[PDB]
Amino acid sequence: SQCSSTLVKHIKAPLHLVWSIVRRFDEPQKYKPFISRCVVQGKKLEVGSVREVDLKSGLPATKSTEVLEILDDNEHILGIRIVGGDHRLKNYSSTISLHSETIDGKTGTLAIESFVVDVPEGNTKEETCFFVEALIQCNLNSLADVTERLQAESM
Numbered sequence: 001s002q003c004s005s006t007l008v009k010h011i012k013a014p015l016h017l018v019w020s021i022v023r024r025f026d027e028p029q030k031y032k033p034f035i036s037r038c039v040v041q042g043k044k045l046e047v048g049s050v051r052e053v054d055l056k057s058g059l060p061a062t063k064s065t066e067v068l069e070i071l072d073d074n075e076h077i078l079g080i081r082i083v084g085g086d087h088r089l090k091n092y093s094s095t096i097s098l099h100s101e102t103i104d105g106k107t108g109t110l111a112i113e114s115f116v117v118d119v120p121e122g123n124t125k126e127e128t129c130f131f132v133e134a135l136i137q138c139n140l141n142s143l144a145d146v147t148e149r150l151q152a153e154s155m
């Protein structure tokens, strides 16, 4: 009644550049293709901040409310937990971390995101686990695009 997995992506951009995008707890839509809008109150990037996420139309759900559990600017770890919305996921937490990774003779970034989540009563472990992986890999392919496009424009 619980599945967990880890997804990775090699990114051809400097870690400081990927981190500047990944840490924006208040602007996930900057690269997450299925999120339309995001609102945060208070000091926006501090442990405990809460975001209300509006998803794109035409999806199984529309809203998500998430908390910022970890934001480590020295080690480049961002940890979030989802706590409300009109989706099917219970006790989802995840952690994305960035790591220096030489690619093509130049320095790049290796993005690693692990998640854990309850299996719904009426659903399979394999069926649950797999749907979230595919969404995260999409998020990380798009993260690589956005940061590589930014890196390019630095010339």
Ligand SMILES: N#Cc1ccc(CC(=O)NC2(C(=O)O)CCCCC2)cc1C1CC1
Pocket (backbone or CB within 6 Å): 028, 032, 034, 035, 055, 059, 060, 061, 063, 064, 085, 087, 088, 089, 092, 132, 135, 136, 139
């Ligand atoms: N139904 C559905 C659904 C589809 C895409 C997103 C947007 C998204 O990308 N959501 C994750 C994220 O990394 O923000 C990756 C996938 C696991 C939830 C967190 C969110 C949700 C619901 C809030 C669960």
